[PDB]
């Protein structure tokens, strides 16, 4: 399967439906009114490094002052890649907003500091490959029992609030994923 | 670092987010509902000497009948410049509204009289260089211990109320700061 056919699940956090330049449909946020807080504060800002037709993905977010997450049903075994999209639309110094990302309890991004990596009002993506086979989840060399659902968590620490802007899961391997341009 | 990348902290007092013609993002006021009073009285007036796309910065203010201020975290040592933006949208004579500005207790502007300097409904900026090095703040030839936070105070005297319209801090020196056009 090619790119749009290979996407099994995708969300525009804090926002409405949007189809990007690759043909990927980011669905309206299923956690609206349910957990966390939506914000459209970034809609006043141009977002560097992303395509301008798609900057609405990075201008809307879901955030919270406590740990929160999304649950994802996965129907079939296979190889998959999770892509997480972020932007820092408020701070402009390091160690102001910092948080962990976990997958079924496994820490998969430690101490994410969006400003430190890319600057202010600029796109940043994390790309995480995984496998689901023989009743097991495998990610970053760690293995545990898979029950049918994936839990993606954004963890509250001491430095401001965890957040996410958009996310998708595709069948395949890392060479299949479109990459942001080098200029960060 | 060039101009937008060099701004570490910026506020539109009494107002919402706004990006100016130089690309500087003035954030929504963090003291809303907390300290002092917001006013949009100036939104009825054209502001002279400002770019017209940016006059909303000077049409909105925070003021108070007692002393008040902003606290600013500074993460790294270096040379910096503080820029303070003002307009007098009510009085049209001298010695009607007069106030001091202090930085960590140091008086850095004595007896500011906005009307006396520029007239009615006209932009006026103060430009204050400083250094943070070896555990110390240095400003206007005076030195004191720096703990990690800067306190910017607007002081109540006998002649009406202290106020501010917008403010920002950039890494660099005074030659790097955009200047208002010459005025009588």
Swiss-Prot record, chains A, B:
Lumenal topological domain: 1-184
One Gene Ontology cellular component: plasma membrane
Top-level taxon of the source organism: Eukaryota
GO molecular function: carbohydrate binding; enzyme binding
Membrane topology: Single-pass type I membrane protein
Keywords attached to this entry: Carbohydrate metabolism, Endoplasmic reticulum, Glycoprotein, Membrane, Signal, Transmembrane, Transmembrane helix
Primary subcellular site in the record, as a coarse category: endoplasmic reticulum
Cellular location(s): Endoplasmic reticulum membrane
UniProt: a carbohydrate binding residues: 41, 63, 90-91, 160
Stated family: Belongs to the malectin family.
Quaternary structure annotation from Swiss-Prot or TrEMBL: Interacts with the oligosaccharyltransferase (OST) complex.
Role noted for this protein: Carbohydrate-binding protein with a strong ligand preference for Glc2-N-glycan. May play a role in the early steps of protein N-glycosylation.
UniProt name for this protein: Malectin
Lineage, uppermost ranks: Eukaryota, Metazoa, Chordata, Craniata, Vertebrata
Gene name linked to the record: MLEC
Residues of the whole record sequence present: 42 to 225 of 292
């Amino acid at each position: 399967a090619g790119l749009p056919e290979s996407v099994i699940w995708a969300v525009n956090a804090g926002g409405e439906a949007h189809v990007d330049v690759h043909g990927i449909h980011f669905r309206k946020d299923p956690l609206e009114g349910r957990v966390g807080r939506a914000s459209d504060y970034g809609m006043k800002l141009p977002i560097l490094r992303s395509n301008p037709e798609d900057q609405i993905l990075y201008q809307t977010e879901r955030y919270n002052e406590e740990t929160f997450g999304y649950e994802v049903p996965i129907k079939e075994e296979g190889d998959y890649v999770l892509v997480l999209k972020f932007a820092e639309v408020y701070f402009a110094q390091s160690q102001q907003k910092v948080f962990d990302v976990r997958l079924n309890g496994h820490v998969v991004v430690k101490d994410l500091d969006i400003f430190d990596r890319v600057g202010h009002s600029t796109a940043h993506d994390e790309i995480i490959p995984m496998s689901i086979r023989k009743g097991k989840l495998s990610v970053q060399g760690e293995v545990s029992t898979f029950t049918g659902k994936l839990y993606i968590e954004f963890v509250k620490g001491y430095y401001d609030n965890p957040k996410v802007c958009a996310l998708y899961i595709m069948a395949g391997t890392v060479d299949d994923v479109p990459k942001l341009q080098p200029h960060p």
